[PDB]
Design a protein around this ligand. Structure first.
Ligand SMILES: COC1=C(OC)C(=O)C(C/C=C(\C)CC/C=C(\C)CC/C=C(\C)CC/C=C(/C)CC/C=C(\C)CC/C=C(\C)CC/C=C(\C)CC/C=C(/C)CCC=C(C)C)=C(C)C1=O
Ligand SMILES: NC(=O)C1=CN([C@@H]2O[C@H](COP(=O)(O)OP(=O)(O)OC[C@H]3O[C@@H](n4cnc5c(N)ncnc54)[C@H](OP(=O)(O)O)[C@@H]3O)[C@@H](O)[C@H]2O)C=CC1
Ligand code: SF4
Ligand code: SF4
Ligand code: SF4
Lengths: 112, 165, 157, 94, 80, 316, 385, 181, 54, 324
């Protein structure tokens, strides 16, 4: 219940990473009901975004940083389920449901 | 403890004796004069120091008092004042723009304290509710209009308060 | 239609007289401005003598007075209470905070004016507006209600 | 005579009509609390006590002492019930 | 006849009984006083020229200070 | 943007979505209203201070029309009515105002872009009198302004639409839903936001929309019956239908049409038994293959299932 | 257990009050206040202001005790600056602090009474509040946010005839207190609503950081005016009332007795008020008079500097606390040598008191929750900042 | 019990490894300690007969961006028994969790939640550590010096969605910084 | 100038702060005797009225 | 029977006016106690304020929440309003001035009192709000609890009179008013009437500030008006019963020719007006009980006293043979 101490090693940290991913995935049906996503996105797409998020941070080697990321993820998930801030194609911070990029940026504005 | 004190306690409980006292004092104010003010025919008291709607003032010749020192803009805790200035055609140092956002202002009077020439004042008017937000964005001309309308009362108040500041 | 206009105008005057003489505001006391508003309802100014009775539920309210700072956290709760108010309904913004954000305009957590959340009919300036200033603002609300011609517009629609 | 009840019926109909006019003119422009069961039971018992008192109060001048004491025995039984309920905390709502 | 629908005006008419005329301004608004002690000696009132559609902003700046007890000078003395 | 747009008829269903989208691109919007000051009140919430400006006008007063248009360089007409009132005929609301608007905009001389919003099935040979008057307006607006752009949305779906809401109100108040043609009429219902997106897209182009007529229809074709299943799935209720043949439907929609122009007092608007919309239901109204669709304005319309019907949650 | 989400949403109770209650029928098991509905980032905003520009933020924290927080902030700045305040100013500051105490207790007591159904004392007490609000307006020109108490003293001297009008107020105020008491104190309904409600022991009060009446109700004799005196509180006679049972009824009686002691202090300030300056003479921290600024080069330079740059405060850090009407109000000020505060942590007594709602309301009836919130005297301006 | 007695008696009685810095001043007696000893030092001061520090006035964080451990956590404490105040400070960084003192002073619970909300410092064994002041779903820690004054997002009513929504901030008139140095 | 707001020569008149008490009530035996006498005599009068009605 | 509707209207319309003006008088007397003025702008002395509030209320849009109990939600205020109106058919204002001279009029009044609970219960349940439902359950419980005491007090009076006819009850007080020997019974009756009309200090539905949402929280426009009007019409009725049972109805204070010059309807009105002043005076004087406290008062204080007074009165009258 209380905030646990900082992880000793990457095995402890990974056990915690797996525990969080399990909790995040198990709440997916609750989210789908709250935001009425039955005709917007698939539950696996929600799972992919969560596992993606975790895979983008696979280069972290410091267990303290991993603990902070897990804590922030747990906080973010709790808000999404309890205090939903509904936006159409957006759940929290996740978008749900012949020329190079330079010329597009050039056409848009002078600030890239 | 005693049959006489027990008796009195029981009687006081059953006959609500302390509830009579509250009724009696409630009825006493029923017949007394009331304190209600018959607004808007009658008004509440105010003082010469009252901080109300801002105004810009002129000298008796018609020249503006403000010389664009920007002290009021700097001291303003709400950043409600915006000023632009430049040399006038006769060489005078005058504003070309003096805006007060009445919806950011906290009516603190700091601007009036900071002004070295008694140009910006908070006058005595408090009845200036509007129907739009933009009417509460006062530009320089609206502020000078306020000064012309309220000058007689503002000048008298400044004479009154010149003995304390 | 030399006769139907006269009868319409009398009906509209009667509707306006009823609606200005009976304004039941649902108070939204958020910060210091609520204390001045409590003084307005108190004995010296006595909003009840104008027919103004403060109601606890939006279902029985004609008017909402936003008196104080509206934060981002509170903004959804304010809008939901507004949506529970039956028509016709009016909104009065009281004080610098509710008008445009006031002293907290540049804060990360404050809504810069309650007119970003609900439509506002009267803005009462001040930080806080005096109790008499709020009373002046309510009499300005009555001035705007008296411009209504609800029967005439529906007759021509 | 039952003649006096007819005005009550016409009164009811008129009250109904007034109710509907007032209500219609605007259309033109999972937690069981046993203490409520217990208060219902108490009310029912004493409702029947008031019911049995109505004939007794109007008949006291004919039934004399026999009727008085039979009603007293009735009250005594029901008041023993009331004391049982009191001591068992059925009259406490905290 | 305005007293029947407008009870705010009636209260002023009744309180006007026995009062003293202090002055009249440019708009026609009339200023009265009593010199008693009921609301702690505060007995200054204005009877607006328009018996209907009167409004507090119609008091000129010369009389605003007197009406709010800010000053003891009437609108006439201030204008002189 | 330096666009100042006078949007007529913005106090209705489509209007709120258009003003919001026009406020986003920084355009200053002028909102003429004909009745109470509380009709444009919800539009003030949209845009920054001074960006959305409602102004009172009288449809039958040329002076007021040019008064509200005197400051704008873009004009959008949304004014129209599907039913009849004793004061305004189908042609009065669908053609005479539209033509008058084009004429004052012609005498204005400063209106760079003009947009008139019409109905998909607007044709001279159409059973519905509304669509006949709509088609007449299409030609009249074009005759007065060849550079004008006509837009022909289908039946629009949204929170304040007049198709799914009256159906849900009827079903909840009676328990069944009637089909005016056996639930076989093919229409292409479009999300109301997509129509507003299309109008904004026609205003943002390099001039390649002037003089054309677009046909805005939903991504999928639906029958009266199929749309009613979407309604029943969303409001979580048991579908029950009473097949009503056309001569029985027109009979129930005869009284209001019959007595609207005779009695001297206003009548309630018709929800489902509107005679003119029933006449439109006899024939299918789909997007012609030779017309210009959403894909012409680099736009992709939104499928009805999901958010576009999420407002139906309030009926569960 | 079923959950009750009850947020009093109008001046009836606070207004941003939002409570999650877990109930067993009508008995409260747990109370969880949700706060931050009035969090406006005051502490962040203060870091962007000069020391003068941050002063009006203190009037708007406990917006029922405005001048008491201005005093605490001014004292903190005077402490870091080692500025000496003239005697007259110290008496004026104490006089208006006790006026501010009465304004607070009048509102706290009668708003709590109105919530339990006593509607009359609110109206009687608010006519007394208007008289005292007039004194705020006569010295500063504002009824509530005076910004009158400043580092170095006060903004302006008292207008002639003010002390006489305060004396006439004091002559009659005891009768006003006696009427509020006669309405409530002896009344059997009032006693049933407050006796043995929200009992707090002395250990509990210290564990939860309680202060003020919330601490003195439990029999702990602790008043910062006596324990750590400031201004001229050491030259004044007053009693510190303490409770013997620690329930809502003792805290009501203490607040009543504290208004009688505030009246006593105001009388002594009126009689002992000396002549002299109302502002510290140093010419680096206080504005010059208007006549001096318009006639002397040195004074004009100082005026220009003071209202543009503001004074600098040498680099240091300290915690300063006063006995505010709601408890200990503290300011942790961190100076970095510049003209703007580096950090300004505001310690609000209502933050500690509201946190203790959970244990105070445990196993109480649903209708006692408002009574307990009333005795805590919560204003969310200071809870949330 | 004056500040002279506290400074001297704490030097004699406290274990030496706890306190790395002792400041005696009219601004306040201050004891700087390592994070691993903060909990034990606060339990000693609370229970010891000659200190009896029973009240935790508040806990606050200070941001020092130029320091390796940028956050300073300050514990203001009070002894009503001896009428004396004490300041105990410790330093922290963005990822190091420090010990919670809720088991010692229950009043610390909301103050530690505020520190986590405002600065991002986390507390071991805190029974319920979540944001307490900011809006739900808030990103960042506003009291950090690098957090912008007006934040990153603002809210408004959006009629098409029939709800209040959050979008990136657009300022009609920017905060004007007046550099008076 | 040199004139500052302050006490008059000799100070202001003394003001009371303590609760002044009030002894207002018949209490005790007065009310009980009044109520008992009313009950007894009024019930006798009820008997008299019932006899007349008979 | 053709003129019966004229009589019924001459009862119902002035009653609705009297209720409109009772609301005004309550706002005026509370204001004066609080040193305020009260409604005095809308009409001369505020005398048009009732009309303005009624017209405002009828011009308000109805809401009608999306509940599965559409019919019951609208019917509940009709039910309570009708019940409050129909009790006046048996109320005598003077000798011979009564619509229905019921021989069972006392039991009929008790039956109407007993029916009054259903409007509140049904409004609370049909609202689809747990707050409204809980508040309704508490209010219904309080009403039935205090109905027991009301009924036992009715029995005391009936024992003294020996007839259920209300006119007979009045005329039995010619020798002496029943409120003189039975003054404690009058006190308990007035308190039980406060608790039955949900009036202060027993007004749970008014305690919204106290986290207690009333049964009529969801109602708007005219349904809300019908609840309010039924409640106030019940207060005038309960003041009329206090007058009929204990203050001798239309009879004069003293059987003297100077007092018999003013008619009986004036006496009846004045006594009713005294009791309505006290209903308002109490609202203005005291705080309110919690639900559990007033429930304890109902069952543990007023039932026992009422029962004891029945026993004492019947026994005393049987002993000395003073029975009717
Ligand atoms: C807040 O308390 C208040 C109320 O709201 C709950 C009232 O009920 C009211 C207003 C209601 C009344 C008692 C007015 C008198 C009642 C009536 C005779 C009918 C009510 C409506 C009208 C005045 C207009 C009548 C119109 C019709 C329905 C058509 C029939 C002809 C008052 C006085 C009030 O202040
Ligand atoms: N299903 C649909 O919605 C479809 C509609 N359309 C067409 O698109 C347009 C906009 O649609 P939508 O917003 O839903 O329509 P609405 O009927 O909801 O709104 C029409 C607008 O025109 C105004 N108006 C109507 N009649 C008159 C009149 N006689 N004089 C002046 N103003 C008048 C209304 O103002 P006020 O509110 O004051 O009456 C309103 O602002 C209409 O022309 C419609 O025919 C296109 C395809 C299908
Ligand atoms: S009153 Fe204060 S906040 Fe307002 S403009 Fe003047 S200095 Fe700025
Ligand atoms: S108003 Fe005064 S302070 Fe402000 S710029 Fe003008 S002269 Fe300077
Ligand atoms: S406008 Fe001023 S007085 Fe009103 S709530 Fe905001 S800060 Fe407080």
């Amino acid at each position: 219940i209380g905030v646990p101490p900082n992880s000793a090693n990457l095995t402890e940290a990974r056990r915690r990473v797996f525990d969080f991913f399990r909790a995040a995935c198990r709440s997916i049906p609750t989210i789908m009901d709250i935001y009425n996503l039955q005709d917007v996105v698939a539950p696996s797409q929600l799972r992919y975004a969560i596992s993606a998020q975790i895979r983008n941070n696979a280069h972290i080697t410091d267990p303290k940083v991993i603990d902070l990321l897990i804590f922030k993820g747990m906080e973010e998930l709790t808000d999404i389920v309890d205090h939903a801030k509904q936006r159409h194609h957006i759940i929290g911070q996740y978008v749900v449901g012949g020329k190079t990029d330079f010329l597009k940026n050039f056409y848009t504005s002078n600030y890239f | 403890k005693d049959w006489n004190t027990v008796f009195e306690r029981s009687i006081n409980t059953l006959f609500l004796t302390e509830m009579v006292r509250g009724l009696s004092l409630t009825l006493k104010y029923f017949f007394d004069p009331k304190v209600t003010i018959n607004y808007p025919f009658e008004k509440g008291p105010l003082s010469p120091r009252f901080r109300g709607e801002h105004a810009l003032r002129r000298y008796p010749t018609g020249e503006e008092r403000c010389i664009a020192c920007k002290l009021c803009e700097a001291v303003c805790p709400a950043q409600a004042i915006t000023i632009e200035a430049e040399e006038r055609e006769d060489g005078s140092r005058r504003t070309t723009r003096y805006d007060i956002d009445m919806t950011k202002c906290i009516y603190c009077g700091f601007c009036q304290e900071a002004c070295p020439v008694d140009a910006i004042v908070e006058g005595p008017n408090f009845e200036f509710a509007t129907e739009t937000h933009e009417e509460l964005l006062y530009d320089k001309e609206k502020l000078l209009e306020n000064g012309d309308r309220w000058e007689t009362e503002i000048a008298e108040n400044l004479r009154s308060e010149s003995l304390y500041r | 239609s030399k006769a139907a206009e006269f009868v319409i105008s009398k009906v509209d005057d009667l509707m306006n007289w009823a609606r200005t003489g009976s304004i039941w505001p649902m108070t939204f006391g958020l910060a210091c401005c609520a204390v001045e508003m409590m003084h307005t309802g108190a004995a010296r100014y006595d909003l009840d003598r104008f027919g103004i009775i403060f109601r606890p539920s939006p279902r029985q309210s004609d008017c909402m007075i936003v008196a104080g700072t509206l934060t981002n956290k509170m903004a959804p709760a304010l809008r939901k209470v507004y949506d529970q108010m039956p028509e016709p309904r009016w909104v009065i913004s009281m004080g610098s905070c509710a008008n445009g954000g006031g002293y907290y305009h540049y804060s990360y957590s404050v809504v810069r004016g309650c007119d970003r959340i609900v439509p506002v009919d009267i803005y009462v300036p001040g930080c806080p507006p005096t109790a008499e200033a709020l009373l002046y603002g309510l009499l300005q609300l009555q001035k705007k209600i008296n411009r209504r011609k609800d029967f005439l517009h529906w007759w021509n629609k | 005579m039952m003649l006096e009840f007819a005005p009550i019926f016409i009164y009811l109909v008129i009250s109904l009509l007034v109710s509907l006019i007032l209500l219609g003119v605007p259309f033109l422009f999972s937690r069981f609390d046993i203490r409520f069961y217990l208060v219902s039971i108490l009310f029912l018992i004493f409702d029947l006590e008031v019911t049995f008192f109505f004939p007794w109060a109007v008949s006291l001048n004919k039934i004399d002492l026999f009727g008085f004491w039979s009603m007293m025995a009735f009250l005594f039984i029901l008041t023993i019930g009331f004391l049982y309920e009191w001591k068992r905390g059925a009259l406490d709502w905290e | 006849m305005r007293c029947l629908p407008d009870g705010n005006l009636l209260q002023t008419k009744i309180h006007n009984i026995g009062a003293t005329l202090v002055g009249v301004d440019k708009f026609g608004n009339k200023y009265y006083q009593k010199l008693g002690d009921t609301q702690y000696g505060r007995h200054r009132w204005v009877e607006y020229a328009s018996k209907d559609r009167y409004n507090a902003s119609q008091v000129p700046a010369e009389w605003h200070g007197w009406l709010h007890f800010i000053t003891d000078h009437t609108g006439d003395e201030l204008l002189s | 943007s330096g666009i100042v747009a006078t949007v007529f008829g913005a106090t209705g269903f489509l209007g709120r979505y258009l003003v919001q989208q026009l406020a986003k691109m920084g355009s200053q919007v002028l909102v003429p209203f004909r009745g109470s000051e509380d009709s444009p009140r919800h539009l003030k919430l949209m845009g920054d201070l001074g960006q959305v400006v409602p102004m009172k006008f009288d449809p039958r007063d040329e002076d007021s029309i040019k008064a509200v248009m005197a400051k704008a360089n873009v004009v959008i007409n949304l004014i129209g009515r599907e039913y009849e009132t004793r004061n305004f005929s189908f042609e009065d609301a669908n053609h005479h105002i539209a033509e008058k608007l084009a004429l004052v905009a012609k005498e204005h001389g400063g209106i760079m872009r003009y947009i008139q919003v019409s109905c998909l099935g607007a044709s001279v040979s159409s059973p519905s009198r509304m669509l006949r008057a709509k088609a007449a307006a299409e030609e009249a607006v074009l005759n007065a302004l060849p550079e004008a752009t006509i837009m022909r949305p289908a039946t629009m779906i949204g929170t304040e639409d007049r198709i799914l809401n009256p159906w849900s109100m009827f079903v909840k108040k009676y328990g069944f839903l009637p089909l005016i043609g056996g639930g076989t009429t093919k229409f292409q219902p479009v999300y109301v936001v997509d129509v507003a997106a299309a109008i904004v897209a026609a205003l943002k182009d390099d001039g390649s929309s002037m003089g054309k007529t677009y046909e805005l229809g939903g991504p999928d074709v639906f029958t009266t019956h199929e749309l009613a299943e979407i309604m029943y799935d969303m409001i979580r209720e048991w579908p029950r239908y009473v097949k009503l043949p056309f001569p029985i439907a027109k009979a129930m929609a005869a009284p209001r049409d019959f007595m609207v122009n005779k009695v001297p007092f206003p009548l309630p608007s018709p929800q489902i038994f509107n005679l003119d919309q029933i006449n439109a239901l006899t024939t299918d109204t789909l997007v012609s293959d030779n017309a210009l669709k959403f894909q012409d304005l680099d736009l992709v319309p939104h499928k009805l299932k999901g958010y576009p019907v999420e407002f139906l949650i309030q009926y569960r | 257990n079923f959950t009750l989400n009850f947020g009093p949403q109008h001046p009836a109770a606070h207004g941003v009050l939002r409570l999650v209650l877990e109930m067993n029928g009508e008995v409260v098991e747990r109370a969880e206040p949700h706060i931050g509905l009035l969090h406006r980032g005051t502490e962040k905003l203060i870091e962007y202001k000069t020391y003068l520009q941050a002063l009006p933020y203190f009037d708007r924290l406990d917006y029922v005790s405005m001048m008491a927080q201005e005093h605490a902030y001014s004292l903190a700045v005077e402490k870091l600056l080692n500025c000496e305040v003239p005697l007259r100013a110290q008496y004026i500051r104490v006089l208006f602090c006790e006026i501010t105490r009465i304004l607070n207790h009048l509102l706290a007591l009668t708003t709590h009474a109105m919530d339990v159904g006593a509607l009359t004392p609110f109206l009687w007490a608010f006519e007394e509040r208007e008289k005292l609000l007039e004194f705020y307006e006569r010295v500063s020109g504002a009824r509530m946010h005076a910004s009158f108490i400043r580092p170095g003293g006060v903004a302006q001297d008292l207008p002639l005839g003010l002390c006489r009008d305060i004396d006439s107020f004091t002559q009659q105020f005891a009768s006003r207190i006696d009427e509020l008491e006669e309405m409530l104190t002896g009344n059997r309904i009032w006693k049933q609503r407050l006796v043995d409600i929200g009992t707090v022991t002395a250990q509990q009060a210290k564990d939860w950081g309680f202060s003020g009446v919330m601490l003195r109700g439990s029999g702990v004799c602790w008043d910062l005016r006596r324990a750590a005196p400031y201004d001229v509180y050491d030259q004044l006679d007053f009693d510190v009332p303490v409770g013997t049972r620690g329930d809502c009824y003792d805290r009501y009686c203490i607040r009543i007795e504290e208004m009688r002691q505030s009246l006593r202090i105001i009388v002594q300030c009126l009689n002992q008020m000396p002549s002299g300056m109302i502002k510290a003479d140093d010419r680096k921290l206080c504005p010059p008079s208007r006549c001096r600024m318009k006639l002397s080069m040195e004074s004009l330079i100082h005026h220009f500097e003071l209202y543009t740059e503001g004074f600098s405060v040498p680099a240091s850090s300290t915690y300063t606390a006063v006995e505010a009407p709601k408890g200990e109000f503290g300011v942790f000020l961190v100076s970095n040598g510049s003209n703007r505060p580096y950090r300004c942590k505001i310690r609000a007594p209502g933050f500690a008191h509201l946190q203790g709602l959970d244990f105070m309301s445990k196993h109480h009836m649903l209708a006692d929750v408002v009574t307990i919130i009333g005795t805590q005297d919560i204003v969310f301006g200071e809870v949330d900042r | 019990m004056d500040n002279q007695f506290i400074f001297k008696y704490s030097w004699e009685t406290l274990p030496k490894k706890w306190v790395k810095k002792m400041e005696r001043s009219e601004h306040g007696n201050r004891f700087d300690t390592n994070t691993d000893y903060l909990f034990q030092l606060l339990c000693f001061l609370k229970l010891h007969t000659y200190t009896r520090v029973q009240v935790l006035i508040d806990i606050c964080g200070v941001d020092y961006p130029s320091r390796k451990r940028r956050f300073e956590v300050v514990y203001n404490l009070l002894s009503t028994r001896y009428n004396s105040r004490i300041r105990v400070q410790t330093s922290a960084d963005e990822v190091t969790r420090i010990s919670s003192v809720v088991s010692l002073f229950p009043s610390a619970g909301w103050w530690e939640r505020e520190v986590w909300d405002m600065f991002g410092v986390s507390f071991i064994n805190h029974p319920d550590l979540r944001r307490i002041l900011t809006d739900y779903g808030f990103e960042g820690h506003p009291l950090r010096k690098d957090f912008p004054l007006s934040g990153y997002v603002q809210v408004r009513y959006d009629d098409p969605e029939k709800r209040v929504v959050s979008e990136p901030i657009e300022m009609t008139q920017e905060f004007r910084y007046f550099d008076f140095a | 100038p040199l004139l500052q707001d302050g006490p008059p020569p000799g100070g202001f008149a003394p003001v009371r702060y303590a609760r002044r008490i009030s002894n207002t009530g018949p209490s005790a035996m007065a009310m009980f005797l009044a109520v008992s006498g009313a009950f007894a005599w009024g019930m006798y009068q009820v008997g008299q009225g019932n006899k007349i009605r008979r | 029977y053709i003129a019966v509707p004229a009589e019924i209207l001459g009862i119902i319309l002035p009653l609705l006016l009297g209720v409109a003006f009772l609301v005004l008088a309550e706002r005026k007397v509370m204001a004066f106690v609080q040193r305020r003025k009260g409604p005095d702008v809308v009409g001369s002395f505020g005398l048009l304020q009732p009309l303005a509030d009624g017209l405002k209320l009828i011009l308000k849009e109805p809401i009608s929440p999306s509940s599965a109990n559409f019919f019951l939600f609208r019917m509940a205020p009709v039910a309570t309003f009708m019940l409050s109106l129909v009790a006046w058919a048996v109320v005598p204002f003077d000798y011979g001035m009564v619509l229905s001279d019921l021989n069972i009029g006392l039991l009929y009044l008790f039956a109407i009192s007993s029916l009054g609970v259903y409007g509140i219960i049904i409004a609370g349940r049909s609202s689809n709000s747990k707050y409204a439902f809980l508040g309704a359950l508490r209010s219904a419980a309080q009403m039935v609890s205090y109905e027991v005491s009301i009924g036992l007090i009715l029995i005391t009076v009936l024992i003294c009179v020996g007839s259920c006819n209300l006119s007979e009850i009045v005329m039995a007080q010619k020798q002496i008013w029943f409120g003189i020997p039975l003054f404690p019974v009058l006190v308990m009756f007035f308190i039980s009437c406060l608790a039955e009309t949900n009036r202060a200090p027993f007004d749970l539905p008014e305690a919204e500030a106290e986290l207690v949402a009333g049964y009529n929280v969801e109602y708007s426009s005219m349904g809300f008006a019908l609840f309010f009007l039924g409640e106030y019409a019940n207060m005038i009725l309960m003041s009329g019963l206090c007058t009929l049972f204990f203050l001798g109805g239309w009879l004069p204070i003293l059987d003297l020719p100077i007092f018999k010059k003013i008619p009986g309807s004036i006496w009846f009105s004045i006594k009713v007006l005294f009791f309505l002043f006290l209903y308002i005076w109490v609202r203005a004087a005291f705080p309110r009980y919690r639900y559990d406290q007033l429930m304890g008062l109902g069952w543990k204080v007023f039932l026992p006293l009422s029962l004891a007074w029945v026993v004492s009165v019947s026994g005393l009258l049987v002993t000395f043979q003073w029975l009717p």
